[PDB]
Amino acid sequence: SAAVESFVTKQLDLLELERDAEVEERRSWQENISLKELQSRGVCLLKLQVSSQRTGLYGRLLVTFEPRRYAALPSNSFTSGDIVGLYDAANEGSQLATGILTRVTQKSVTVAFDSLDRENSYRLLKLANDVTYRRLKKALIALKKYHSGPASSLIEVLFGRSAPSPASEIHPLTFFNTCLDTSQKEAVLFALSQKELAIIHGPPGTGKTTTVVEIILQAVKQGLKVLCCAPSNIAVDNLVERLALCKQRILRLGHPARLLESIQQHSLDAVLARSDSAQIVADIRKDIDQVFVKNKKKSNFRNEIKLLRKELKEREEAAMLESLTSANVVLATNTGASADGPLKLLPESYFDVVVIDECAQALEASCWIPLLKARKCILAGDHKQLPPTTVSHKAALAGLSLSLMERLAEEYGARVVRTLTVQYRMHQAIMRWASDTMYLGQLTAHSSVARHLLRDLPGVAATEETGVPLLLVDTAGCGLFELESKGNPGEVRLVSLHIQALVDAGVPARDIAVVSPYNLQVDLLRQSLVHRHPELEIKSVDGFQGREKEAVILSFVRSNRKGEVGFLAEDRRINVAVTRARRHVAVICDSRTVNNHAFLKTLVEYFTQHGEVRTAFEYLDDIVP
């Protein structure tokens, strides 16, 4: 109650810092930045046209927006759950309303609300997510004001006040998944045995989610109820897909970010909509069928929806509690799992185990939403990769960067953590660098990826580039300096030349990824490359978490006189960056600058030991020393 009080007040502060930081952050973008290229960044959509408007789940009015009669949407970072602002072109730039994405396709976008004409011209503006802030702030007060309950023991252990209780005796397991390596079989067994806290640690390519799934299947098999969460939609949807293939009884507190049919089937609205209610849409219709007769001009109408509203509620809450009550696993992003959301309906002490996947990517405040809905939690992910992102760096340092899983791991180590060790992605030479610098040399390469090269690929010819798994082309000391975020047009030309090398040898662009730490380098690189290789992904490290290509090319950007790298000195980002690659990783960088940081120095020292190393002088002829 003390360690709790302080942690909490500390957090509540770190938040308004963030919230204030994010808010002002957006004000500037909305200020000194045109509507036209805000969209260019994928953070506003225009100009849009109403395609449909139907009252949906809860009283909420679901409006669907598509590009005016042209037709797919301009690429964007809109995702289910986002907060969105609605404007009219012919209106006074005044904000008409605020909403929530429920479904974002390549050529449509759906917002829930709580007038609108089928003839344009609407705008859509990504805004701070005040709901998340409001929820986080509350699971935080709810924690500090926690009583005597199932969650009691977990909390002691979590806050050091007590210690991981002795692990129940291991009652032999039959594995649903038959192809599990020994490393995973033990993580599973261990995890079921804890009666408090378990953490499974999954380095790049080791099959974490596969092991999270087995663990979940085993807990359903013991007849336990599981609330399973992650910080991202995408993490949640991958679990949904997996569990679904394993014919499990699940319910995702929607909505999905991935559009796969398999996954759309299992979200709340499509669970309810699968009987036994054709009635509840006859309430929806009934009132969205009267906002029709709304335009007569007018009140006393209000009392009539007030009525249909309260009936929809009572009916919806019932079919909900049912669908909830009969699933063995309820799935939600950490936020979705909130105490106001659908879960309010369940009787406390309903769930036994909370599972949180990609915990190392989630900020601890978010984890305390589901975490106190059960007596036992199971954390999974890799705290040696990217931590939760923030806007207020000064807040991050303050401890917002510190996820639940990471602290508990450094804290408890093997009293609680099991780490997977066999990886199925990288050539041994790529693995070995990450193994040793990040994962204590414990990683091992499954025989199906160890040894694999680009020349092994169908249609790919054998080349000085295709037959090597490691390549460094070094910019020291070729006057290929950075700019004045950061950019480096010298590097941009080297990576295009080496892209051309691979593509010309037969490697399809769709198998390659260009990646850079810096947003402006990405921008610089898209500019020079997209028309040349339309299928080639070009992203920042942070926009490539969890991804994987046969070949990855990296651009370090930092090359200067004062020998500075910066944020480039976040090793986990480099770790993530090197580990996306399967058969081939090329690094374009300035030795002379990069070496002034130890982690980076040993990275390039590695490439020098193993794999090939070239100088820019071999690529560029107009180069002046």
| Domain spans, the chain | 1-29+128-423, 30-127, 424-625
Dump the DSSP string for 76-128. Answer: ----TT-EEEEEETTTTS---EEEEEEEEETTEEEEE-----SS--EEEEEE-
In whole angstroms, what is the distance from residue 578 CA to residue 553 CA? 9
In whole angstroms, what is the distance from residue 376 CA to residue 152 CA? 10
221 assigned ligand-binding residue: no
- What is the 3 state secondary structure string of 348-417? CCCCCEEEECCHHHCCHHHHCCCHHHCCEEEEEECCCCCCCCCCCHHHHHHHHCCCHHHHHHHHHHHHCE
In whole angstroms, what is the distance from residue 524 CA to residue 483 CA? 11
207 assigned ligand-binding residue: yes
Give the phi and the psi of residue 409 in degrees, each rounded to 5.
-70, -55
Distances (CA, A) of 274 to 10, 58, 268, 342, 589: 45, 17, 10, 18, 55
Nearest to 399 by CA among 89, 26, 18: 18
How far apart are the two ends of the chain, measured CA to CA in Å? 64
| CATH number of the 30-127 domain | 2.40.30.270
204 assigned ligand-binding residue: yes
Nearest to 607 by CA among 384, 444, 430: 430
**Taking every pair of C-alpha atoms in the chain, what is the biggest distance, in angstroms?**
82
Instruction: Outline where 536-623 has alpha helix (H).
Output: 571-579, 591-594, 598-609
58 assigned ligand-binding residue: no
9 assigned ligand-binding residue: no
In whole angstroms, what is the distance from residue 64 CA to residue 84 CA? 13
Q: Are 362 and 260 in contact (CB under 8 A)?
A: no
Q: Which sign, positive or negative, has the C-alpha torsion 491, 493, 497, 503?
A: positive
231 assigned ligand-binding residue: no
Strand stretches in 389-487, DSSP E: 417-419, 422-423, 444-445, 470-474
209 assigned ligand-binding residue: yes
Which superfamily does CATH assign the domain made up of 1-29+128-423 to?
P-loop containing nucleotide triphosphate hydrolases (3.40.50.300)
Q: Are strands 83-88 and 122-127 parallel, antiparallel or unpaired?
A: antiparallel
The position carrying tokens 């500390």 is 10
Nearest to 147 by CA among 297, 285, 349, 328: 349
202 assigned ligand-binding residue: yes
The position carrying tokens 């049912």 is 322
User: What is the separation of C-alpha 369 from the centre of its chain, rounded to a whole number of angstroms?
Assistant: 18
Cα three-residue angle 81-85-91, rounded to 5 degrees: 155
Nearest to 184 by CA among 431, 352, 424: 424
| Residue 486: both structure tokens together | 């950061």
Domains 1-29+128-423 and 424-625 share a fold: yes
Task: Please give the method by which this entry was determined.
Answer: X-ray
In whole angstroms, what is the distance from residue 595 CA to residue 592 CA? 6
Instruction: Outline where 32-73 has alpha helix (H).
Output: 35-38
458 assigned ligand-binding residue: no
Q: Are 317 and 340 in contact (CB under 8 A)?
A: no
| Residue 25: both structure tokens together | 């952050």
What's domain 424-625's architecture?
3-Layer(aba) Sandwich (3.40)
The position carrying tokens 């290789």 is 533
Distances (CA, A) of 582 to 255, 512, 577: 32, 10, 12
